[PDB]
Structures are given as C-alpha cells and as structure tokens.
C-alpha cells in the first residue's frame, strides 16, 4: 500500500504545516502537524477542557463506531518549545492520503497548553519519530508509520515541504519526479529516538564550504534551523546590522536586508537554503526588525534541522531495519 497527502503552511511565514487526517468511522477529518521529532498522535477532542479549545476541529470518539477506549492508558508530553498536552487514549481507524491503519492509538487531549489553544489551525500532532519516544503509559504505543510499515510497498515516508506553498507527505514510495539529481543517503542513530544524523558541513552564501561534522535531527515539527553558535555567528556576520537579541530571543536583522543562502552538507552532496527561506518577518507587527530563521542551538542540547532546512530538500525517512535518511535537491 501507499499514501499521499498534501501538507499546507498554516500562515504566510511557514510557521508550521498541516496535513488532513481521517480518524474514525464515519471519518472525522482533522488537520494535524506531522512531526518527525515526536512520536505521539494526539488530537483536540470532545474531552479537551472547553476553555482550552479556540477554533480547532475536535475528534469526538463517541461518534466513531470504531473507537475503543484503551483502558487505563494516559499520555503527557512536553515539547522543546515549552508547550505541552495530556489526556487519555483510544484506538481507532486512521487514514492519511489513502493509507489506512486500523487500531491506531489516538491520544485524546484533556489538557493543552496555551500555545496550542492560541493556534486555531492545528488540531493536533502526528508523530513520526521512533516509537520508543511515545509517551503512552503504562503500555507504550506505536506511531502511525510504525503501524503501517509492514503493509507499505517500501518501508519509507518522504517529506516534501513547500516554501510559501503546499507540499507533500508520501508513505510507502519515492516519487522520482519530485526531486532533481540523486538522493544522497546518510546514516541515522536512533539512540535518542530521533531521526538523528551528521551533516558534513556548511557554507554561507557564495563562501567556501567548511567541512565539519554537525550532529542533529531532521525535525518537521520545528520551524527553524538550530545550529552551533559558531556556525550561526558566521551566517549572521554576513548580514549588515544583524545581531543576537536576548530580549527578542535570538538573531534579528534589518527587514531591508537581502539574506545570503545557507548550504548544508549531506555526505558529498549539498543542499542550498535560499536566503528568503531564512526571513521570518517582523518581530512584532510593524517593526523593521525581522526574526532570523537560523538560530543558535546552544542550550537546546541538540542541533535541529527544522523546516527551514528540510523545505529546501526532498527528504526520505527510510524505516528499513537499519534506518537511514535521504536528501535530494528539488
């Protein structure tokens, strides 16, 4: 089997991407944030504290003839950005772009933190990291990909995120028309539960490539590109007026700037992030100070190849017995 679904930016800055997901019988379609940095599929629901719902579409398990309460199971998750959610668990039928999993754990939120409430466009998350990170207790549950894998034509999914435009998540096949050149594959460590790999280096604009190993995670659920302070300083030094602002919470730059590109290495291959992908717009409405899309990972504890990087590539998440990651230009 295979699946193919369109993923759409939630706003004009590509702050995140939503993908429609069918849950239950009859189908209840929710727009979920597909997150290769976590491993819970959770949704706003009829059980979510009413004051914490503000415009989201909810899953109502009592209206699904295939929903079953997973007795005694609870979940609770906290994300890198400080947001969180928790609740109980159902199993139900879940379909993504024509690919159907029966008995998928659907984690129903009883509580969500303010940032989730405040974002009306995201109805929940669909985790695509390794199931070892799943938070369901006392019996850990599998991700949608893990459940689908054996049925797929090939044990892979691909992320093709657009810049200021829709893109695609495919399951079970590689669309050879969706990229240019070849896909370069690189080793993955699953030791931390992430799609963790090592970039071979970087360049800023038309500058020379610096060969240096940068361990980090391919994380579709993180908006920006978080890299070591040395790398980030080298980037922003090429932008007149750019500075790190502790009050704003990272590098800012004059909105009048033309940003340089940023290249990262995948083995001997190179992925070029155009400068415009690095512009996240005014820090506050009407400001001429703009927020940078490349930021320091210092104090995160890990480097993160988020959407800023991933959207410059066609990315293969290869879930073979030994997982790997593939990157192609597009």
Q: What is the set of active-site residues?
A: 35, 199
Element (H, E) at 217: strand 210-218
Task: Report the alpha-carbon distance of residue 172 to residue 116 in Å, rounded.
Answer: 30
Task: Report the alpha-carbon distance of residue 311 to residue 265 in Å, rounded.
Answer: 15
**Cα–Cα nearest to 279, from 124, 164, 175:** 164
Cα-atom radius of gyration of the chain, to the nearest Å? Answer: 20
DSSP string, 18-76: EEEEEETTTTEEEEEEEETT---EEE-BTTS-GGG-SS---B-GGG-TT-EEEEEEEEE
């Amino acid at each position: 089997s295979t699946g193919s679904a369109t993923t759409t930016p939630i706003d004009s800055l590509d702050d995140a991407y939503i993908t429609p997901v069918q849950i239950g019988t009859p189908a209840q379609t929710l727009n979920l944030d597909f997150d290769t940095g976590s491993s819970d599929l959770w949704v706003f629901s009829s059980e979510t504290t009413a004051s914490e719902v503000d415009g989201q579409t909810i899953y109502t398990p009592s209206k699904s003839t295939t929903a079953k309460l997973l007795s005694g199971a609870t979940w609770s998750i906290s994300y890198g950005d400080g947001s969180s959610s928790s609740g109980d668990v159902y199993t139900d039928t879940v379909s993504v772009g024509g690919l159907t999993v029966t008995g998928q754990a659907v984690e129903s939120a009883k509580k969500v933190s303010s940032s989730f409430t405040e974002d009306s466009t995201i109805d929940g998350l669909l985790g695509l990291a390794f199931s070892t990170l799943n938070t369901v207790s006392p019996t850990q549950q599998k991700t949608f990909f893990d459940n689908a894998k054996a049925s797929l034509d090939s044990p892979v999914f691909t992320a093709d995120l657009g810049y200021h435009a829709p893109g695609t998540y495919n399951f079970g096949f590689i669309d050879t028309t969706a990229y240019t050149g070849s896909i370069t594959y690189t080793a993955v460590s699953t030791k931390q539960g992430f799609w963790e790999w090592t970039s071979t280096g970087y360049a800023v604009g038309s500058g020379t490539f610096k060969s240096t190993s940068i361990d980090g995670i391919a994380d579709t659920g993180t908006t920006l590109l978080y890299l070591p302070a040395t790398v980030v300083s080298a980037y922003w030094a090429q932008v007149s007026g750019a500075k790190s602002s502790s009050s704003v919470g990272g590098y800012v730059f004059p909105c009048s700037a033309t940003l340089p590109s940023f290249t990262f290495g995948v083995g001997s291959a190179r992925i070029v992030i155009p400068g415009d992908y690095i512009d996240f717009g005014p820090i506050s409405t009407g400001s001429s100070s703009c927020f940078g899309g490349i930021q320091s990972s210092a104090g995160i504890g890990i480097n993160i190849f988020g959407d800023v990087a991933l959207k410059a590539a066609f990315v293969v998440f290869n879930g073979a017995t030994t997982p790997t990651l593939g990157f192609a230009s597009k």
